[PDB]
Amino acid sequence: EVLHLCRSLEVGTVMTLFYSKKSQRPERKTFQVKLETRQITWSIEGSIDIREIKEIRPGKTSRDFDRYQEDPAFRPDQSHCFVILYGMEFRLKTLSLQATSEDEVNMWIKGLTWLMEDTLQAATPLQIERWLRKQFYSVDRISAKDLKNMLSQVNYRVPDITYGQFAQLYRSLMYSAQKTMDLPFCQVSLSEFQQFLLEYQGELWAVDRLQVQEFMLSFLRDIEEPYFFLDELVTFLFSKENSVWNSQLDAVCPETMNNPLSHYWISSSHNTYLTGDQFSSESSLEAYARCLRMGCRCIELDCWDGPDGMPVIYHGHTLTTKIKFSDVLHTIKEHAFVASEYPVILSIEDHCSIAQQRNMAQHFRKVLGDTLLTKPVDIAADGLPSPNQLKRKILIKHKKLAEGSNDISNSIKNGILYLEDPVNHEWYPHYFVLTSSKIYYSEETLHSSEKWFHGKLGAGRDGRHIAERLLTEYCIETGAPDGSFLVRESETFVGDYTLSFWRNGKVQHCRIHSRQPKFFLTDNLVFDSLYDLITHYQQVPLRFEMRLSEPVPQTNAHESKEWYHASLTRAQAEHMLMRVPRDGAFLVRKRNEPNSYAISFRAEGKIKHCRVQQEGQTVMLGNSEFDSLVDLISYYEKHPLYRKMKLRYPINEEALEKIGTFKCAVKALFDYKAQREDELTFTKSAIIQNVEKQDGGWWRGDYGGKKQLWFPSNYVEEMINPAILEPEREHLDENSPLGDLLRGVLDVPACQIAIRPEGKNNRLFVFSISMPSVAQWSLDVAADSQEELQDWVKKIREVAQTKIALELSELVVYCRPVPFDEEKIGTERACYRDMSSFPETKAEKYVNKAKGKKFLQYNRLQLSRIYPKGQRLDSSNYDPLPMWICGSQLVALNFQTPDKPMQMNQALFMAGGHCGYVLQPSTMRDEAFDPFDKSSLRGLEPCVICIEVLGARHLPKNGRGIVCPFVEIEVAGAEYDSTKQKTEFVVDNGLNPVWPAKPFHFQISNPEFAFLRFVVYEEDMFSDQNFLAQATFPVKGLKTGYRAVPLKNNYSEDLELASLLIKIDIFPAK
Template sequence: ARDAACACASGVSQTARRDGKELSHRISVRFNPCCLISSLTSSLTRTHTLTLSHTHTLTLSHTRIHAGVLRSVHSATSDEEMVMWVKGLTWLVSDTLRSPTPLQIERWLRKQFYAVDRSREDRISCKDLKSMLCQVNYRVPNMRFLREKLPDGELRNGDVSYSHFAQLYRSLMFDAQKSVSHTLIERPEQKISLEDFQNFLIEHQKELWATDNNKVQEFMLHYLKDPLREIEQPYFHQDEFLTYLFSKENTIWDVQLDQVRPEDMNNPLSHYWISSSHNTYLTGDQFSSESSLEAYARCLRMGCRCIELDCWDGPDGMPVIYHGHTLTTKIKFNDVLSTIKEHAFVTSDYPIILSIEDHCSIVQQRNMATYFKKVFGEMLLTKAVDISADGLPSPNQLKRKILIKHKKLAEGSAYEEVSSSTPYSENDISNSIKNGILYLEDPINHEWYPHFFVLTSNKIYYSEETSSNQGNEDEEEHREPESLISLPKPVFTCVRCFVCSVLIWFTETTRSLKVTVCLCSPLRWKGDYGGKKQLWFPANYVEEISPTAAEPDRSQATENSPLGDLLRGSVDVSSCQIVVRPEGKGSRQFVFSLVPVASPRTGPVLDIAASSQEELKDWVMKIREVTMTSEAKLEEGKMMERRKKIALELSDLVIYCRPVPFDEDKIGTERACFRDMSSFPETKAEKYVNRIKGKKFLQYNRLQLSRIYPRGQRLDSSNYDPLPMWLCGSQLVALNFQTADKPMQMNQALFMLNGRSGYVLQPSIMRDDTFDPFDRHSLRGVEPITVCIEVLGARHLPKHGRGIVCPLIEIEVCGAEYDNAKQRTDSEADNGLNPTWPRKPFRFTVCNPSFAFLRFVVYEIDMFNDQNFLAQATFPISCLKTGYRSVPLKNSYSEDLELASLLVHMDIVRGRVSALGYHGREGSFEARYQSPLEDFRVSQETLLDHESRRLRRARVSADNRA
């Protein structure tokens, strides 16, 4: 592999075709320390893919679906050349990931320096240096500050060399945070010897392996990578030891848990949490985003073990996969199966469940069954593991197997009408009669802007302003950048150019709000603009708009609409007349109006524009049909659900995951069958994951599988809180993997366990019949803990906008309802490179530590006192180390941020703490009432003490008088 990497460095020729012409060019990988390979590598081992095809094509599939870039495709001239590239890149990835923190810092320093040193003279000016430090989140007060930090020789010519720049960086980092390390070493003014470091690991870090002197020496040599220190015993300089404290080698996460525990994989499937994805094929929202094969590859590489296939009748007798009756693009069923086969067991060997949402005809169902067998072969589970078993098989029994979750016929039936396990709902956009992009006129500037419209059996709903150019963006995404192709004309490229092409993607409206405001202006109004909800805006840029009949009370309307939180308004079409405007209106030619029948006073006329005459006719026809047959269409939809037929060939492939309607009366009885399972939208699941029915639902999940998925109104692909569902034993809590939000971050934290295999054994307490998920007193045999955390400092925090951040750290415990708590530090002014905080302990009492997460979130406080997300790190509490630990930070997509970390001191005390040491949880009953009770208790004790002293004085005075 190393030889292949060297060959890649020399470059190979590639060919591509454009406009029918074959073009040739060479690509190469330069072995330069300043080349940021980690931008590729941080995800390649987990979620990037290197794919080989029979056409000598190397496909580099990126994780950053959220950025719009799905893949880069390079073609090679032969199989040997293609394999060489794959081996070389794979070796570079693994080598970079294994590199110790000092080497990664060196790479980062060179990248920053050479990005400024465009003259290639290995020198930059002090002015450029000051600007560079601002770019890395450090405020330089003035040029005098730099002159004091730099040696005199650097100031005479006004330039700074790389070596002095690196020394300046180390000096800035050490001077700002040296107080942290000085408290840990007895002789802070000297070098830190092997013995000193070993004592630190044993006394402060409680590392058992550090009792072996040889292991400590081996660790130091690997970390430092300094040949000069291999001659004698290794040692740390003071700044190197401080850097170690912030490094990934000192992580708070117990790396032993990165390995799968085979002994924990012998329980029935119903005893595990299983990583599950909702509408896996989507890369964005639920109504207009792209469906992608890369989305399947990404989820599988992330350890997801339950993925969804939404199948609809397609051409040539084969289904297509997309979100039905929406603007999402379609992908071929057989391509999806090939992608699943290729990536199924790369990250984990444990079973995959394919959740089939079937809307296909009998003929295409037969073809689906044929392709399942043809593509998956021996991987496909076609018979029960143990016929006599009284429970589901274990993950070990199903290793490298693919299970089909689909409705199943009763024994002896060929084509039986089956009832749906999920009730018919008009609020699901897939059940809409018609939907698409139409235009509404802005009442202020009279411009027409696109909105997403959904027509149901009695109403037409429309969203906030949306984008109508998704097709153009998709086209741009796959376009080959010309800078990668050598043409006959001269082409000039930058030697130290690290970015070949940049495409900026916007998800907001194209109209941006840019205003200049005096900070002393006191008048601000709260309002909505684009994707910004309930923020403060200058009063002179705000207009109060009164609600109309077409825009009903939002809280009630969004709950019952297929657009959910994206809802702008709705119109009852049965009480409206449709008027086509042949002359158009304003700049739009194809316009129709919805006019209230009874009286214009009942609501305003809604003018709607289409993009073509055909589209206008189709919408008008559909709306008129709805006004005449609204009730009949609703009933027909329900009847179609009840009359759905299943092909025998497909039914035979369903062995264990048989969806059936949920029957609460069967729980705990002989009628309950472990092969049956039920699916719940989050709104229905909330009726069972509560204090009243939570214990009963947990009993159901001990035997059978349950799958929970987002409600249909979440068109923005947002996620619900998975914690209550997990706590009540639900195994398949399906989330939108493409969305960067807190629920997805919690999901990725949970499935860090057990080697990221996608299966996590639920705590044994959840299999205790007396356990109630919402009652802390039912925790028999579970020892509570008290977690004490001090935030000491941070390094390399990301920027937010152009300014230098003022960070604060929020520490949160998430878990059972009675354990939830949140505390935060003060903000640190204008420093995102190396901020520090005064030592202040934050204490959390956790009653159920086996189901609790510790979450660090870094926020920036802006000039309006609003907090903006910068970074986060989330871990299961039971898997954390104590002592002085580094917390590696991640972005909102749980991707590693280069060198970004917190330094915290962590202590865990097992058992109940005394009342004097108890700290109430913020937002809980104890937090609200503990302080007044303590004040009352102190006041009462003070009063009694005062009264006692007064009585003693009176007694003494009486004795003296006597």
């Protein structure tokens, strides 16, 4: 049926790919489903893993298609286009496709929709097989060296081949690698597995022998009576079918959706339109689609006047992009109820004029129609309606008319300006924020190329011995074929070259003549280049006769790179690097031992050293293997080496001399008597002022009463500009408008400002900040436009000397914002329709031991909305548990951020499959309950959990090496139920590690507000702990016995095959 259709998508459809890259023109390609692996591939140029697909959207609504909405280059059609949104992160990737006919689109939509659901729900062995298929096709047949490299890429350290052999090899390895696990229980019969389910797992259904039979067959899929091989039993222990999570809880229980809305935790998003940070990230319709599909129910719109009478949405007074209110409203309409039938609240932060408010209200009614909530559910009620009563409804939260009528918001100027790096002298962007008192700025925001050409090795018998060594070393160690070769400059015949190749265990040298152009071996053909000559003899033999084969790679290319030092001690490296005022300064130095190097680098004002060993044709950094030092360093110029630090500044003598234009002073190194009338006369140590710097050997400056006269530049030393140095991060406002992004603070009244008319350093619009009381202190700042330069200067200079539309108010039925009045709580004055909102800092004043009970009482009748403080420009999140435990319902989090709070959010709303409403337990909505008084629980049964971490499979990599994994186990809830514990780490294994015996015990007094959290970290070579994977569960949904913990990434998306196996017992039993 649909199966026949899916087989047809294997053939190949030609469709136009609208690339996400704003430069790549739309190209046409042949798209095929690969059912073997459950992928989509196109001409192979690209690949989508179907398990990563989140939405298959008929039509032309994507950024890729939007690039051509006006442009006639291409005309996306509603009818001939669809979008595949897929990925592991909040920001999904998109594959936007235009087909030649409506029937093709419908085919792909229909087929992929089914492959999406089938791939996600597939039995684990099928997932494993598809994983192996994908691994194999990554490398018919493969070599064993390929195999060692392939296993290293999947986090396994290995201390002809066909796929079948590979499959069996993987199978044996996973089982043998974890034999040692304490499993008190070559074939397992349907009766043995049945007893296991009943005796260890507490699976009561299993007493029905036939269900056990069907259970095993649902897992195997491949029949007489079912059984498991031992390796298959262990595979099952790790599988999702054996998950610690009771999937029953995934379904909504209508009976728990009948309390008033104030009794529910409600999945809530802060500034939903944003995809990244609060200052410059892109606003996107996709963020609304993403949040609503994650189960979010309360989303936020920041409305500002748009250009044509309709509001746009962006973060006011920042560089975040704008999107149209109309487009947002249609996105909401399309996605609000895909994941849940339950009501959506629109929190409107309205900055619009009355006229554009009026258009909003009109558009709300036109677009949403009956979906919009315009009347109260029950004018006689004494409390908010239930989620069940508001199904399929959208509520407007907006400030409402009475009848008949220090962050970047409180900021003078915000923007991106460029500062000049004092080490590499490039311009980099930084966030700048001017307040009424200060500037805050943030942290940064032909043959030569060939492998066989080794250049000049030596100048006598030197070069020949070196060439022989390199070639012998290579051939023996790698078992290289005869004809493996390299080329060098001839030591004997100037201008000529010498070829060395392997033959019968021995090296052969052949002179390559160079003449003018003609290159030729003796008595052989002539060629126009040395490249052509070698390219020729790699295809046909030279005269024995030997065809050239494998090029010997250069292992010593580092010797000429600027960061390499062949002779340099540890202390000498530290002295050089402590002179560089930026982290990321680095160098490589050879050590006294053979085959030993050290990377020395500056991080956090301190120098650190890590060793690198040469091992054959490769280098080792920890367990991370690279082809050479040059490749190692190149990798860590593009990927962090230490914490978040990349290798940035190669440090040698020249770099240190250049570490370094407004009223600059220089010190004279020697006397100079003016040789000409326009030249300056001075003595050694004279300070020359107002210097005008210029290449050519001559600068201009003032001294001895003479103004702007010339002098040799090599006669002076530049006085340091203290502004290049790093501000003292020790003492440095922790809650500036930039939050943790802060780098520097300027006391504006103590500064002067001036525009440089000439610009500077290939920037046109530049001003200089100075401080009259700190000579030589100056900061050159570039802006992107003269207009921005002008606005910045006058605002800085000035600091240094110093109605609601009824049509819209009508739509606010519930969620009516009023000022919080503590004294109305619990009185007849409290109104169930009125609500208040709390920045996270004000909220902490009510969710503490003193006021928390009073806040619970408030929240039983009325909604409160919590949102992050303004200083979280990075879009970090606050801990939501202290708010939830005082009954707060709308605890708004930045959904784009993969931090722990959002992992707790998606964990909490697992109860009900992310419908977005979780009924608060009865014990909390009781008069006695107090989140900071364990005694308020009365006679609630507590919970004791005993856990042992036995092993893991398919742990994700973190960079190039092999993870050394350890697992942290946390219970999260009230303060009195919260604690953490952790295993030891395992050495060099993420694919199938097992852990020592370490029984953990957790005790939970309030199991109704409690989460069990597993975080897998690595212990890296610097002894830092780096996140690898994660799984957080509500305690109520936990099963017992030997259970799998399926792992997720930091965005709470499922990782392929990654899981722990634990022994988990819960008391009292139930």
